[PDB]
Structure 1
Amino acid sequence: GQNMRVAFMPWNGYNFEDSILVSERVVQEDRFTTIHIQELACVSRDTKL
């Protein structure tokens, strides 16, 4: 994971009941941006028609 700067404080309801309030600089800096690779297969078969 990444070394995030946390403050422990209730903030305006936005970290109620285990929620996490992330800054925007965590998105600008591509900190938790992950690459995911999908394989999609198209199968040309022999049909009866």
Structure 2
Amino acid sequence: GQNMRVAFMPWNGYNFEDSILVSERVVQEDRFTTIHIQELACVSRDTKL
């Protein structure tokens, strides 16, 4: 993963039960952007007509 400048405080219920409040800098610096390569196939079979 990444090294995240973390803090420990409640902050307005946005990290309430187990939640995580995340900066926009984490999204801006693209530290948690992940590539996901899906294969998507198409098959020409032999139908009857």
> Which bracket does the TM-score occupy, shorter chain normalised?
over 0.9
SS in structure 2 at match of 1:26: helix
By how many angstroms is 1:10 displaced? 0.2
TM-score w.r.t. length of structure 2:
0.98
Structure 1 length-normalised TM = 0.98
Gaps of 5+ in 2: none
Q: Distance in 1 between matches of 2:31 and 2:38?
A: 22
Per-residue deviation, 1:12? 0.4
Deviation of the 1:17 alpha carbon: 0.4
Runs of 4+ in 1 over 2 A off after TM superposition: none
CA RMSD of aligned residues (A): 0.3
Q: Percent identity?
A: 100
Unaligned runs of 5+ in 1: none
